[PDB]
Every structure is written in structure tokens, then in C-alpha cells.
Symmetry: D2
Subunit: 451 residues, 4 copies
């Protein structure tokens, strides 16, 4: 039982100076070459244990799922200040949400239908653009947001509805925090980071208006409600409950954060498909063969479209939008691969390192739907595929998201083809911002009706 | 109420008190809470309590009267002996103390800091002539002049303003880069228990790091061969002496540059004020006259004979309020404070902005007013609410070097120049472009016209 | 979410002054009347949560088995001083022992055979006493000890073998620690107790000799031994063998502590049977009807003797030899009957209060085999019967001990009858020492050969 | 650099228990010391305790790092989750107050010295009533020292046969025993819990409520009579503090208990003292002669006499040094990560300051194991300090009773020998001063002695 090996940390800086000018991801890869799949790295004076590769990450998040399932200190209540009670009530709330979330996919109106409706409204908008050159960011935030809106408030919004615009602004609107390296070293010496959520005034711009809107919908909802026949999330909340309107803000927030990842995946997907017209075609042909140019694509179609499915896996794999996964905390002294990780140690499951694992993918860095296709061109599981993560806290939205990706993706290409000022050979898929995320470069595209 | 915890607004699950902030910023938000709950109250960031200290009296009772209890660092800076053993822990203690002590030699002592500043002051005057009265942004200039003081002290000699090592080092330490967030991401961070932002996530930083590091290696060498006690030529060979790992120097340099940046920004703010108040620039120009003539360069001993220029610099620091929430600390033991109890390890914000604007100590908290530091006979007077370097066990290690830079740079500049800008006094706006945890002065233009 | 209610503690003394002249057990009962089945009591400045009644003890030890399974601070390794490693190894050792113990019960000779053999050697000894008045303490320690010797060393000892006498002395020989109330108050104020194991010099009297004997047996064992013929625990140890001998000393220690309880249960059992001769008769008659006076009793007989079984249950229930159970520790913040018990809080499962639960026994305080018999005089389960405790840490020896109690009790009474200077009406079953235990009064008894 | 203190490798469950001698814990610790040095780590169960040996180590810990080594054990630590803070600070204020009230000097209704002097006279009288018979002085010594506390607390001394006083002697001083076996002890270690805890013995409650009641009445009677500024004793000091303002009468029980625990050690010191003096008649004589030269046979000894009697003083020091009644000191707890002699002791580590090892430090006493008044006397026969002398411990928690106790030892000891001489059946060569058990205590063997009136 030794602790995981790693580079020796400096006082105050930890291993900060052992990062490449080439990025955090490369640095992690370099460390991994040196020390192996489980190594320890120091941020400030704090140890974090870093998991790399499909096998290590799956042994941790799946085989010792419970041990590797803790949250960060920011999310741990102090019973000396708040009592137990909020602790247990949060537990129950979480489980209620974890449960209801599953229910939407099983039911039952249905999520597939709401997404189909939304895809229709989308195709219509794309015609209105009459093949002009656009940035799809806003459009893709809109179509994925509405799926949440329909599920929570019961009904989708209109793309130009000023509440829906205000809520797109609250949740998706960037703001930035300015730092310098001298300040960062002083933060490390302090023990405290300068930035924390809500330090930017912008956040509050739209908050109260959104809050108020929620109040109204809870009321309009309460007026008409009948268990055990709950319509949307709002009136499920009312039953469970039977101040707190803020529980809804919180849940909506969580769902929008996943939705942002969903929207960015589509936006990245369409960048890839500009770069690879031949793939756009085989997808157009598989839609022809399976759906025709008549009906809208449906979820049952996916099973009969292994090439479109492989293509979407591959879009999520290279898009790698959450490259360090979400850090967790170990809940107890844990034996792992011949080392010991002490209770409460912070862990990074580096998902990027699975999604690019050379033991699981033939060309880890090259678009290759063949990663998900067998000899007979059927869909095959690949164990390195884990963009929603794994185990006890696997993405709550996996199903909603995978479903949005399929319907929006085929429905768009069934009705349109794409083009841009940039020649395939010259599309650059490398992330503009590569810190803790992999945000796709912004680009222009034109949606031309196949009709 | 035997021993209660400090009162505060009720927190929401996950968000804490995040929705209890104003569209008008944290500082207002805090002041509002203060009105409601008093000088010591509890606020929740995520699920974590932080106890907030407001007003001169509370802040002084904590940081001074219970200095030790209020002296801890945040968790990021606490070593885990399970991972690293004790030893590094005690070594850092010793290193910190050595550095704390070394800070005073500048204080009491081959050539002096005051001298080093005067020399820098001269080079500056020269540079300003070269401007020839053109409009310029003084950011870079002020970073340069204050940075050099640290360079002279550490490497033994100042740099040339266009020396490409010094430009590279200005870039490492002072160059802004930004981290992009959204509100939905932030609420997900709170839910996670972890922040996305942490030092070094921006790739920019490494741009100049290795080059700076190598340069340090070289100076440690050139130092090691020539050097010998007890003739500590500068900080580099003070480090060699103690030592008989270069990265220890990078760390110390880093710390001094962070305080320097605040020093430079204070000057930059100071001059914006002085554009807005020409009448004060004049009384300062006049005081320098009685005191110093127009030929010799100002010296530190002049400060005691210039209460109006002193008071004016206090007042620049007060309103500049560049570290409004102080530096968060941690309580080292269960502590009784003003009728409440703060548990061991609780995080604490000493809100220095609230002492610097304390109505009980400053007649016009929000208005430039040298009278705040002057008595009836226009002599300098202590004001208790004045605490921009903080107080107590961890008072700014640079307080001396900084106060000294501010005096020599401000008087030496005004002795040789006068200032002007496209913007009419009435229209200069001193409100911080962005605050965040900072109160950053709006960028502006200014002209330095040689006096003759 | 409130903590369990209880009496207000004084500084330093805690609730010490809230105890009766009438004893700890009654004091708690008075407290239970006042506060309910779950209450908080202070020893020194430390809270301990006390569980009373069959329902609460079963809801904690069984329904939340894991949460209520922790050990006291004295048994918790500090990884700062010893690393993890010893921690995990002890976990593995414990489970290996937990396992082999169950296996042996299932099993060149069965455990039951070894107890049968020992019952024979006992019967013989009782004849050599030729009906003389004796104190059976030593005899009952001997017969139960040998069962452990045979299992660990492979073969039983001779009752006068001087190794075995030395062994009996180490493990079972009383020594005492002297205290005053003024010293005790000073200990509480100190935060430290004076007593700790091994402060009495007497312990070492026989330790090295015993240790050496173990060495020898490990050797004599290592020479001969081989699967698929493990002869006993010693060579099981050798086999899992794949600083060292002392692991046997430790296990032997543990087994002798439960053995002592077993021996004391027989000794208490025979006291009861002096007091209720008719009961001894019905037992003699059920042995007649079922075993006869020819063969030795066997374990399969027990199923066919519900009266003797019910009478042994009742002996264990009233004997109440471990009335506070063994304190445990709570492993996490726990919800329990409307309260919260914080992580690490010490917990007393007060077994005596189950064994005397008026909700489960008609006459809690009166010998009554009817507690375990139905209308047709068949054996019936009683939920308040838990003298081995319950749940994840139920007595490791439950099976060996129940089997010793049956064969030794029937085998003795099949061959002897009992008598004493004291008239039934005058036998007093109240414990001479009512500390944290319930030690039966010492007495004299004669065994007489039956005919 | 900063490694933990060295020690013997512990076994699972048992810790270092098998590394103890048949020869007792103290010898076991001395053997480890030889092997590992003055600071070493030993394991009780799975719990590390750092052991401090020698005058120098114990003084560097309790004195030079006084605060760091001043913690109490877990039993005495409040969990604020259950009790809040408040009881915690109250206790602090309470400790400090008590500490303060005790620091009044020996002479100032009337002084402690006076009370002791009075008590010595009632003692002398009792020893005459024995008319030189052979007695066991245990009860007598508990009585005389107990009374000092009674006088201080209740305002007046008790009569040696007063049935309240006999009941209180019984509550506080009466032994009871807890029976254990080694197999049970190994199981306790495995459990994580000890069977023994204060109050498991029913005997304690025999006299508790009667004592409590007595305290009630006294408080009331006191309440009736207070004329501060004319405060007679501790009872109305307590009442007075409360007045500025259960915990009510219970705080007194608790304090009384604490004082009787130190009193027991004071009484056992005298009892051990007189056993030594049977063994060394020539020392009894030089003491008798120094009492002659200094006090004469006419007045009662007074405290001011001690300064003028360096031989009696040295003899009493030596009685306390070899008596060694608290050989392991009182275990403490380290309040913070602490650098000590090149090692680190982590926050909350339990510490044994082994006072026996200072009291017998060959570096400070020429003949550590032999009675030798010379340890405290210089060349001219004047008293000299010895650094290894620390039977009340040192530092922030030095015995609260040091003054009262040293004063009782001087007045009782001189007064007795001014008025009596001593004898016993056993010849001095044959007196055996080795303590009966060796387990955290060094109880002197019981013995008989005769007190023979001197008759000037
Ligand atoms: C579009 C692709 C998406 C990806 C790749 C993704 C990925 C993830 C990942 C990596 C996690 C962290 C799992 C862990 O902690 O181990 C996560 C958590 C979560 N995601 Fe998603 N997400 C996506 C979309 C969504 C959507 C649409 C939702 C809608 C609700 C969503 C809701 C959540 C929630 C509530 C969690 C919290 C998991 C927990 O800690 O229990 N995500 N997601
Ligand atoms: C106007 C200029 C400066 C201001 C207003 C300023 C203010 C402060 C403040 C408020 C603190 C935190 C006090 C606390 O935690 O209680 C601090 C800490 C510190 N400052 Fe400055 N500082 C300034 C310049 C400098 C300079 C030039 C240096 C260069 C040597 C410097 C070095 C430090 C150091 C080393 C600390 C750490 C103190 C500690 O934690 O013990 N500061 N400063
Ligand atoms: C009538 C005889 C016995 C009784 C009534 C008895 C009762 C108990 C009880 C009440 C416990 C406490 C369980 C807990 O922690 O909740 C216990 C534990 C234990 N007993 Fe027995 N016992 C008896 C005989 C034995 C015997 C013969 C053995 C021989 C191996 C034995 C070995 C153990 C062991 C190893 C444990 C520890 C269980 C654990 O914590 O994992 N006991 N016993
Ligand atoms: C020869 C007689 C005595 C000896 C040798 C003695 C020795 C000691 C020792 C070794 C300690 C432990 C200090 C520590 O924790 O480090 C102590 C503490 C104490 N003694 Fe005594 N003591 C004696 C008599 C008394 C008497 C007569 C009293 C009566 C009031 C008394 C009251 C106390 C108290 C209250 C403490 C607690 C100190 C604290 O931890 O705050 N002692 N004594
Ligand atoms: C990401 C990684 C580590 C951390 C961290 C925070 C506090 C202490 C240690 C590590 C935060 C974000
Ligand atoms: C700056 C950095 C961290 C924090 C913080 C607050 C609460 C809990 C953990 C960290 C506050 C300010
Ligand atoms: C038995 C032994 C120790 C305890 C105990 C109580 C409080 C604190 C530590 C231990 C309880 C029962």
C-alpha cells in the first residue's frame, strides 16, 4: 500500500511548473507516460490522484463505484452550521430527481415526441434562413433548451419569445474573469481562489425575471393539477413537496449545463461534417434507405442505422467536451491497483484519456466511424467510449442527450445539406479554448434545402 | 445566547446565498447584509459558511487583538502530511520566517532600497521627457518602474526598460489572460463541489516561464561564483547563503510581483485622481517646493516634512481600495468573537473596504478628502480606519517598500512634470471598470509635460 | 433531524450522578422510562447513544447493519503512524477468520465429535469426584477450553497437563485493578482512564511459556502438514501462510474470551437447575424419551428435544452475561427513529433490555421455558432472544457455543443428577458482580451417578 | 528531518503489549528508553502514545513548549455537535477561576497554615490516645489531610469520629476493585472499548447522596450567613461568584472530588514517609535534632521554620522522589503539530511524561535508587535546587495543590516527630520499601508502626 507515484511538488506552486506550454491535456499525457495510469499531481498543496485510460477509469467508477463517488468540499454541508437534516433532505431530493429523470425516458407527451416537434420547428427556421451563412450557436442552444422547457414547464417556447430569450441569456451567456499569473501564485499562497460563482454582476441581469416567471408557472400549474397523473416536472415538484421555487431554478440550472454540452456537441458535429462531405453523404443515404424523404426520423430508426449511430459516437468521442470528467472525491481509504487512495482524496477521471485510448481506438486522433462498426458494418460496443462518464454518477441526461443528438442530427440532414466558405481540407477541428474544456472554434455554415 | 454562530441570511441548497447578491455588486451586497445583521455575519458560498468582518473595529478586534486565532491560510495552502509527511510543513515554516526577516533588511539596510528607488525615479523622469508631452497609457510604465525595484533587490541590479528579459518577465507576471464562464456552468460547479478555474489552466502562462526560469538559473550561477559573506549583494545570494530548487526564487519573485502590481495600480489610480483634482496636484507641487527645491531629488526623510503630500497618498490608497475584501483567512481554533463563536477552520473575510470607508472614522467616506489624515494645524494624524495593507500577524510583507515607492515615485514625478488630459476634471470618472474581488481603475490617457 | 434526548450532563462528571445505588442496568431502565428506547447519556464529556428494547436493537444492528458496525477508537489504526496497509491486511485477516470459522461449523473430526469426546472425558471426571461437593468453575473452563485447543492445535489436552493448566491461568485467571471515587473523578477531568489492558503484571506470568508452546506446535505442524488434509487451525494458518506466531496468540485470546462466556453460561445453568429440580427432571425425561440411557447425546437430538432447547434459551436469556452488549461506533451520519446519530458516535446496544423485553417475554424476570415453546410444546422463535447479539458482528462463536451448551448440558444430566447444601427455595440467582457484566454467585454442587 | 518518534513495531490488536517485562511497566519503559532514547512511540491497542523520559525531555515538553503539551484526553473533550460551544467556554472560565482561587498563599477567615497547624495538634492528641500501640496509619493520614480540605471548603474542620466525615472518607478513599482476565483484555483491545469506566462499581453510590445532601445543607447554611466582605471559605466564594450571576451543588461535589484525589496522594506520601523513617532511624534522629535546634520542644512548628531546616526539607524532597507515587505522570495530549527533539508529534497525539524517569534521573541524582538527602543539600549543608525533582509535574498544569501539599507534608511531618518517636516490629535492615503492584501507581506496602510519646 504505497500512495500513487508522481512528480515532486514545489512549495506553494505544487506541480504547476511541470505543465507544458502545450496544454494541460498533453501534460497529463506526458505524466502518464512517466508514471502510469494512476499518478498523483499537486494543485497548490493539495494532492489529486489522476486516473488515465479506459481500464483504470472503469475499475474506479464502475468496479468501486461507491468508493469513487464523493463530491467536492464546496458541496459538502457542515452540520455544525446547518444541522443534519438538510443533509438527508438533499439526499432524498437528489434521489427523487435521479428517479424522475429515468421516468421521463421510460414514459409514456413523451420525450421523443417533444424532440420530434422541436426538430420540425427547427427545419422551418432553417428554411426561413434561405441558405444564408449563419453561426448555429444560438440556434442549437435554442432547440436543446426547449426540450428542457417542454419537460419542466410543460410546453416549449417560441424561438423569439422574450422570456425564452431572457432565459437563454441567464444560462448560456458567457462572462469572463480576468486573472494574471502573479495573482494566481498569490492565490495559491493564500489558500484561496479569487473567483467563485456569482462574482460577475452579469449573472443577476436576468435572474429575478426568470425567478418570477417560475413563480407564475408554479401557480398556473397548481391551479390545474391531478395526481397520480403528473404532467410535467413543475407539477411533479408540487406533489413531492406536498424559498422553494428556488429548488426549480436549481434543477433547471443543472439541466441547462448538460444541455449546453448537448448543444455544443451538435455544433461540433456540423463542423466535422463540413470537413468530411463523404460522411454527410453516407448519412444522407442511410436516411434515404431507412426513413425515406417522407416521414420525420424517429428513435426506433437508430437501431436500423448503425452508420449514423457510429458517426454520432465518433462525434462525441473527438469532441471530448469534458476532457477531465468531473472531479470526484474518494469516500474511504481505498485500495486501487496496488496503491492506496486515502479517504476524501480528490480524483480526476480523465475521460479524454479513455476517448483517445490507443488500446481501444485504432486512430485515436482521427475521425473514424470504424471504431464503432464491425466487419458486417453492424454497430459494436467500444469500451473506451465514455463521454457521459460511468458508474454511480453517470450523466443524468445521457438518454435525453443521446436522443436529442439522433433526432436533431438526422432530421437536419434529411432536409438540408451543408456548405461553407471553407474548403474541407482547411476546416480546423482544434479547440479555440482548451483549458478544462474543449470548445469548438466558431465557424459559418449554410443549410440548403434538399426539398 | 451563550455561544451562537454569527447571524446571516438563510442559504439555499447548492446556491448558498448567491441569489442574495445585488445587481450592484458584492460590495453593495455585503454592505446591505451588514445593515441587516451587524458587523459580523455569516454568508454561504455553495455549502460552505464564511464569516464576514465589517468596520474598523471588528476587523481590528479580529486581526490585531486575536491575531493568532485569525491568522490561518485556506485549504489550498495546507499540506497533507499523509501525502507529504511533516517536514515539508516545518521547512515551509522556517522558509517563511526567513523571508519575513529578510524583508526588514530592506527595512534596515549593500546599497539601500530607498536609493534603488531614487535611481529608478531618475530613469523614469528621463523616460517621461522622451514622451514629449504625448498622450499615453501609464500602465506599462508604472509596472516597469515598480517591477525594477524588485529586480534590483533580487538580482542585485535593475533592468533596462527595453531589455528583452525584463519585457518577457513583465509578460509572465503582469499579462492578463481570462477564464470564460457562464451562469449555468457556475451552478453546476457549486453542485459538483469543485470550481473549474484553478491557477495554471490558461496556457498563456507557460509562454515565458521556462525563459524566466533559465534566467534565474544564470543569475544564481553568476552570483555563486563572485559572492561572499557577509557581503550579501542582494536576495539571490542571501538565498545561497542560507541554502549552503531555483524554483524557490521563482515563487518569492512571484509573491513580490503580486504586491508590486498593487503598488503600480495605486500609482496609476493616484494619477487619475490628480487629473480630476488639479487644485490638489498644485498644493502638492507647492509643498514639494517649500520642502525640496526644484533641483535635488526627493528623499524618504522629506515625507515627514510634507504632511499634505503624505495625507494625499493615504487618501489615494483609501479610495483606491484595491483589495476590498482583504485576503480571506481561516480561524485556527474555536474562537469567541463579539458574543459569537467562530469554529476552528471557518473561513473569514476581513472586508477592508468597509474600514477604508468607515463613516465612524472618515468624515466623507466616498469623497477624496486629505483632511481625513490632517489635524487642525495641518499636521499628519493617524486614522484607525486606514488599513489598505491589512493588519496584524499577516500585514502586508511589502508595506514599507510599497509606501516608499509611492512617495518617491509620486513626488519625483510631480516635481518634474505636470499633467493633463483630453478629459475635463468634472468628467473624470473614478469608478472601477470592473470590481470582481478587485476595484480596477478605468484605463485612461494622460500627458506629462516637463516643468522646466 | 434532532439528536436523541437524554438527561443534562454536568461538566466533567457527565451523567455519572444520574446513576442509582441500584445499579447501572436499572439506572438505564429508569432513563428509558423517561426518554424512550433511544437516548443520549454522557460518560465524561463524551455522548453515547443507548439503544433499548428488541425493536430498536434489531432496527439498528440488523436493518442498518453497516452503519452500526464500527469499532471503538482503541481498535482504529492511525495511518499517519502506521500507513494504510496494516489497515487492509487486518480487514483481510478478519475476513479469513470470519470465513474459516463458519466453515469449521459446517464440516478428520467434526466439531461436534470433538465436543462429544470432551463430554465423555468430563463424565469420567465427574465419577472420579464420587459425588463430592465441588465448585464447577474450573471444570467448566477446562471442558470448554479444550474444545478450542482441539480446533486450534489439532488435539485436546489432558485436564492435568501442565501446559493446559498454564493456559487456563493466562486466559481465565482473574486479577484486579483498584480504584477510588476521587481517582475516578480525576481520570474524567484528565480525559484519561488509569486502566488499560496489561497494567497488571500478573498477565506476563504465563505468557512467554504459552507463546513458546505455540511456536513448537507451529513447527510440529509445519513438518507433518499437508492438504487436502488441513488438520486444524494451526495449519490453516500455515496454509493461508502461502510478528507471525503472535497472530495465533491473538486468535486464541479472542476464542477464550467467548469460551469464558460459554463456561459461565453452563455454570449459571446448573445454578438455575438446583433451584428448579422439576425442570431438571423434565429434561432428564426428555433425554430418556429421545436419546435413552445408552448412546451419548448428539447434535441431531436437539431438534427432537424442544423442552431442553427452550430451557437452554431461557438459561442464556436470564444469565444475561453481556448486558450492555459490546459498544459499537456509528460509521456515518445516520437517521434512526426520527433522530440523527452523527458519524463516529458510540452506541450501547443494551442486550439485557431485549432479553427482558416485556413486549416479547411474558415473564421477563422469571425462568419460563414457555417463552420458547408454542401451544403444542414445539420450539418457537422469540424475537427478543439475542444473547449473541445480531447483525454484521453477531458472535463469531454462536454455533460452537450453542453446540457446547447442548452436548455438555444433556450429556451431564444423562449421566448424573445434582444436589446441594442449599434448598431450592433458598438458591439466589442474583449476580455477585453487577458491573458491565452479570457474574453468577459462586456455589457448591454434587454430581451423582444416575443408574 | 521531521520523522515520528522511533519505537518497537506494534502487533495488530495487541500493539506493543507483548513487549512488556514480567518485571512491570516501569522497567519495560526503561528498557525501551535504553533502546530508542528519551522520546519514543509505543502502541496501546492501535493507538500510538509518545513517551517522554528524563528530566531534560520532560522539562523541554511541559515547560518550554508548555502550551503544545497541555491537552487533555478525549474523555474530557466536549463534542459541540451534542453540547454546543458554551459549555466549552464556561468550563474554561470555570477552570481559570478555580485555578485563581487556589493561588491564594498559605497565610490568608484564617490561613491554611493555621488550619494545618490546628489539625496537627488534634493529630498529636490522637496519637497520645493510642498510648504507643501498634497501628496502621492509613486511616489516620487520610483523616488529617482530608480535614484540611474540609476546613477550606466548608469553613470548619470535622471531628475524627463525626459520622458525616466518616461517610465522606468512605466515598472518596474507599477502595473497590474491577476484575479482569487476559482473554477479556485482548477482546477489549479488539473491540476498541475498555470494560472499565468510572462508576461501574455500585459501591460508589453507597455514600454519594448522603454526601450530596450534606453539601446542600451547607450551602444553604452558608447562604444564610454570608457577610462578604467576610467570606469564610470556598463554599461562599462559590456562592459569591454565582451571585454576580445541577451545576449548582454539583460543582462543589466535583471540586471536592478533585481535591481529595490530590489529598489521597498527600496522605500516601506521609504514609510512605514514615515507612522510610522506620528503615533509617539515624535520619529520624537528625530530623529530631534539627527540630530541637530550630523549633525547640516548646512551640508548634510553623511554615517559616522550613527555610531554617534544610536537612528536614531535603529529607521531605527525598521522600517524595523515592515515593514516586505518580510514576507515569498524568497523560496529556498535544494540541498542535509539534516539533520536538528532531521529531514531530502530530496534533492530538497522546503523551506520557514519565515523571518516575526524572525522579530517578542518573544525570540529576547521584544515587537514583537510594535514599540520599544529599541530592538536595550542597557542600555547606544548605538546600539546593535539583532539576530532576518534579513529583507535582511541571508547566501549565503543574499540580494545583503543590503549595497546600508541600505545606501539609512539612507541618504534619515535623509536628509528629517533635512529639513522638517511632518503632516497629521489623528491623530497619529488613524494612522493604518496594511497592506492591507497579501498575501506574507505586502504592507503599502496608505496615505497622508505634508512635511513642517523647516526654521532653
Ligand atoms: C451532450 C452530452 C452530455 C455529456 C457528454 C454529459 C456529460 C456528463 C458528465 C461527464 C457528467 C459527470 C459524470 C460524473 O460525475 O462522473 C454529467 C453529469 C450530469 N449531467 Fe450530463 N452530459 C451531457 C448532457 C447532459 C444533459 C442533456 C443533461 C440534462 C439534464 C445532463 C445532466 C447532467 C446531470 C444532472 C449530471 C449530474 C450527475 C451526478 O453528479 O449525479 N447532462 N454529464
Ligand atoms: C500598495 C501595495 C500593497 C498593498 C495595498 C498590499 C496589501 C496587502 C494585503 C491586504 C495583504 C494581505 C494581508 C492579510 O492577509 O491579512 C498583503 C499581503 C502580502 N503582501 Fe502586500 N500589499 C502591497 C504591496 C506589496 C508589495 C510591494 C509586496 C512586495 C514585497 C507585498 C508583499 C506581500 C506579501 C509577501 C504578503 C503576504 C503576507 C502574509 O500572508 O503574511 N505586498 N498585501
Ligand atoms: C454463550 C456464549 C457467548 C455469548 C453469549 C457471546 C456473545 C457475544 C456477543 C454479545 C458478542 C458481541 C457482538 C457485537 O459486537 O454486537 C460477541 C462477539 C464475539 N464473540 Fe462471542 N459469545 C459467546 C461465546 C463465544 C465463543 C465460544 C466464541 C468462540 C469463538 C466467541 C467469539 C466471539 C467473537 C470472535 C466475537 C466478535 C464478533 C465481531 O465483532 O466480529 N464468542 N459474542
Ligand atoms: C504529594 C501530593 C501531590 C502530588 C505528588 C500531586 C501531583 C500532581 C500531578 C503529577 C499532577 C498532574 C499535572 C499534569 O497534568 O501534568 C497534579 C495535578 C493536580 N493536582 Fe496534585 N498532586 C498532589 C497533591 C494534590 C493536592 C493536595 C491537591 C488538592 C487540591 C491536588 C490537586 C491537583 C489538581 C486539581 C491537579 C490538576 C492540574 C490540572 O491538570 O489542571 N494535588 N498533581
Ligand atoms: C479542481 C481540482 C482541485 C481542486 C481543489 C480545491 C481545494 C483543495 C484541493 C484541491 C479544485 C478544483
Ligand atoms: C476564494 C476561494 C475559495 C473560497 C471558498 C469558500 C468556501 C469554501 C471553500 C472555498 C472563498 C474565496
Ligand atoms: C466503554 C469504554 C470507553 C467508553 C468511552 C466513552 C466516552 C469516550 C471514550 C470512551 C465508553 C464505554
Amino acid at each position: 500500500g504505497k500512495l500513487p507515484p508522481g512528480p515532486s511538488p514545489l512549495p506553494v506552486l505544487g506541480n504547476l511548473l511541470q505543465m507544458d506550454r502545450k496544454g494541460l491535456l498533453r501534460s497529463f499525457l506526458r505524466l502518464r507516460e512517466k508514471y502510469g495510469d494512476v499518478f498523483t499531481v499537486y494543485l497548490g498543496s493539495r494532492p489529486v490522484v489522476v486516473l488515465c485510460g479506459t481500464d483504470a477509469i472503469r475499475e474506479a467508477l464502475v468496479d468501486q463505484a461507491e468508493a469513487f463517488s464523493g463530491r467536492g468540499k464546496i458541496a459538502v454541508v457542515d452540520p455544525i452550521f446547518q444541522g443534519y437534516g438538510v443533509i438527508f433532505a438533499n439526499g432524498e431530493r437528489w434521489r427523487a430527481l435521479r428517479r424522475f429523470s429515468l421516468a421521463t425516458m421510460r414514459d409514456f407527451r413523451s420525450v421523443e415526441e417533444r424532440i420530434q416537434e422541436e426538430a420540425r420547428c427547427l427545419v422551418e427556421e432553417l428554411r426561413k434562413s434561405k441558405g444564408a451563412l449563419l453561426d448555429n450557436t444560438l440556434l442549437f442552444h435554442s432547440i436543446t433548451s426547449n426540450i428542457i422547457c417542454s419537460i419542466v414547464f410543460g410546453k416549449r417556447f417560441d424561438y423569439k419569445d422574450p422570456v425564452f430569450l431572457r432565459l437563454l441569456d441567464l444560462f448560456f451567456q458567457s462572462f469572463s474573469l480576468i486573472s494574471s499569473f502573479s495573482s494566481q501564485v498569490f492565490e495559491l499562497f493564500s489558500g484561496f481562489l479569487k473567483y467563485f460563482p456569482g462574482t460577475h454582476r452579469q449573472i443577476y441581469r436576468n435572474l429575478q425575471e426568470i425567478n418570477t416567471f417560475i413563480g407564475q408557472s408554479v401557480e398556473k400549474h397548481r391551479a390545474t393539477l391531478d395526481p397520480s397523473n403528473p404532467r410535467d416536472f413543475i407539477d411533479v415538484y408540487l406533489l413531492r413537496m406536498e424559498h422553494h421555487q428556488n429548488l426549480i431554478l436549481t434543477v433547471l440550472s443543472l439541466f441547462f449545463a448538460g444541455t449546453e454540452t448537448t448543444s455544443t456537441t451538435l455544433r461540433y458535429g456540423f463542423l466535422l461534417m463540413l470537413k468530411y462531405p463523404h460522411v454527410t453523404e453516407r448519412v444522407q443515404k442511410e436516411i434515404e434507405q431507412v426513413i425515406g424523404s417522407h416521414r420525420p426520423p424517429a428513435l426506433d430508426d437508430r437501431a436500423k442505422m448503425p452508420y449514423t449511430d457510429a458517426v454520432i459516437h465518433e462525434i462525441q468521442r473527438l469532441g471530448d467536451l469534458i476532457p477531465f470528467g468531473v472531479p470526484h472525491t474518494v469516500t474511504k481509504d481505498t485500495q486501487f491497483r496496488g496503491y492506496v487512495i486515502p479517504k476524501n482524496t480528490e480524483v480526476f477521471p480523465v475521460l479524454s484519456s479513455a476517448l483517445h485510448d490507443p488500446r481501444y481506438f485504432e486512430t485515436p486522433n482521427t475521425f473514424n466511424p470504424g471504431h464503432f462498426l464491425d466487419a458486417n458494418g453492424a454497430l459494436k460496443r467500444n469500451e473506451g467510449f465514455m463521454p457521459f462518464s460511468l458508474g454511480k454518477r453517470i450523466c443524468l441526461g445521457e438518454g435525453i442527450a443521446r436522443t436529442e443528438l439522433f433526432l436533431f442530427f438526422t432530421t437536419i440532414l434529411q432536409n438540408f445539406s451543408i456548405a461553407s466558405p471553407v474548403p474541407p481540407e482547411d476546416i480546423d477541428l482544434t479547440p479555440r479554448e482548451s483549458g478544462v474544456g474543449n470548445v469548438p472554434p466558431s465557424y459559418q455554415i449554410r443549410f440548403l434545402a434538399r426539398h
